[PDB]
Design a protein around this ligand. Structure first.
Ligand SMILES: COc1ccc2c(c1)C(=O)N[C@H](C(=O)NC1(C#N)CC1)Cc1ccc(c(Cl)c1)OCCCCO2
Length: 215
């Protein structure tokens, strides 16, 4: 594995979005992973629609939450692997509420076929992240609330409550660390991002790692 990766540089990362007062982090993590897997599949990097999932995902609970795996299933089983652009289906549940699903009028910006679950091991993950790009992961976010910058090495790691996106890492560093993109706008952490210690299962990060599949 490389000493450090960061798919933000490779241009696989859309800007930091805001999920608002709605429990749709599961939908951001999902979309962000599909954003990066589609880019890294050699396409124009494009912003995909989180509102699609929030309003239309019948396997999940919209603004009440969900699982990244179940979004991946619903996009395949229910939407023929199709994903609408942000542009054509903009995010509107920012202040907590859940508009009805509208299937028409939007434009497809990305397609998928399957998803995969990755091992609860950290070098393993580092090995998939660096070969494939941003990975949908779930975290204990308890210590994200008080986060203000730098490398978190004393994270509460007792329960998975939050979907986020893993975009890079760095072993050359003391301690080594992961780069994670959040959905709490660029006014939080380090312009939207948080760095946590790598190699201790910080915030239980290796527990629920997944990614969609393109082509
Ligand atoms: C289909 O709806 C479900 C079903 C089971 C759920 C969860 C949602 C769940 O608790 N999801 C977390 C979540 O939705 N967090 C919110 C935020 N921000 C809405 C509160 C975000 C989340 C939390 C934990 C997690 C995953 Cl993959 C996602 O790993 C699985 C741990 C137990 C599964 O908990």
């Amino acid at each position: 594995a490389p000493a450090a990766v960061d798919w933000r540089e490779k241009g696989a990362v859309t800007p930091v979005k805001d999920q608002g007062q709605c429990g749709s982090c599961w939908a951001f993590s999902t979309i962000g992973n599909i954003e990066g897997q589609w880019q890294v599949a050699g396409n124009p990097l494009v912003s995909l629609s989180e509102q699609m999932l929030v309003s239309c995902d019948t396997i999940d609970f919209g603004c009440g939450g969900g699982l990244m795996d179940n979004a991946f299933n619903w996009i395949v089983n229910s939407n023929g692997g199709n994903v609408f652009t942000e542009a054509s289906y903009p995010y509107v549940s920012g202040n907590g509420e859940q508009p009805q699903c509208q299937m028409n009028g939007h434009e497809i910006g990305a397609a998928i076929t399957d998803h995969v679950d990755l091992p609860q091991d950290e070098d393993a993950i580092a090995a998939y992240l660096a070969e494939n790009g941003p990975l949908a992961i779930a975290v204990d976010a308890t210590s994200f609330m008080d986060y203000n910058g730098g490398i978190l090495t004393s994270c509460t790691s007792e329960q998975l409550d939050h979907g986020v996106l893993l975009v890079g890492y760095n072993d050359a560093s003391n301690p080594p660390y992961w780069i994670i993109k959040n959905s709490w706008s660029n006014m939080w952490g380090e312009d939207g991002y948080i760095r946590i210690e790598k190699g201790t299962n910080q915030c239980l990060m290796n527990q629920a790692v997944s990614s969609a599949v393109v082509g």
